[PDB]
Design a protein around this ligand. Structure first.
Ligand code: HEM
Length: 108
């Protein structure tokens, strides 16, 4: 990716992470950041099989519903290899002034 090592956020193409939804290399996207479980497949409670189905793309189905617990919020941090490419990063015009919270009755 050129340069000494890095500079800013490393992205990964949406078209690419899709190709890493399988045994030989398992990535996933919970929402925005891409993770890897290529070796981790075995280390994670009841994974391997059920990962492949949610990996490469969005996996937050089970994550939004059940929510995991504190443990998984804190441990996962080194699983995060980077973000998703500008395929998703701006989406539209990229939120200029906060996500929404626009004109909430009175002064912001
Ligand atoms: C971002 C990558 C992930 C990491 C680092 C991670 C981390 C963990 C950790 C630390 C636990 C144990 C305690 C807890 O619930 O907090 C756990 C359990 C579990 N995780 Fe994950 N997890 C990840 C993604 C996923 C995804 C995408 C799924 C489903 C497709 C999933 C399904 C489960 C289930 C089901 C358990 C509990 C065992 C069971 O009841 O079968 N996890 N995870």
């Amino acid at each position: 990716m050129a340069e000494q090592s890095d500079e800013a956020v490393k992205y990964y193409t949406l078209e690419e992470i899709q190709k890493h939804n399988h045994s030989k290399s398992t990535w996933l996207i919970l929402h925005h950041k891409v993770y890897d479980l290529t070796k981790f497949l075995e280390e994670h409670p009841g994974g391997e099989e059920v990962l492949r189905e949610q990996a490469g793309g969005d996996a937050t189905e089970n994550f939004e519903d059940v929510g995991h617990s504190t443990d998984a919020r804190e441990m996962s941090k080194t699983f995060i290899i980077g973000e998703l490419h500008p395929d998703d990063r701006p989406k539209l015009n990229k939120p200029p002034e906060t996500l929404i919270t626009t004109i909430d009755s009175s002064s912001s």
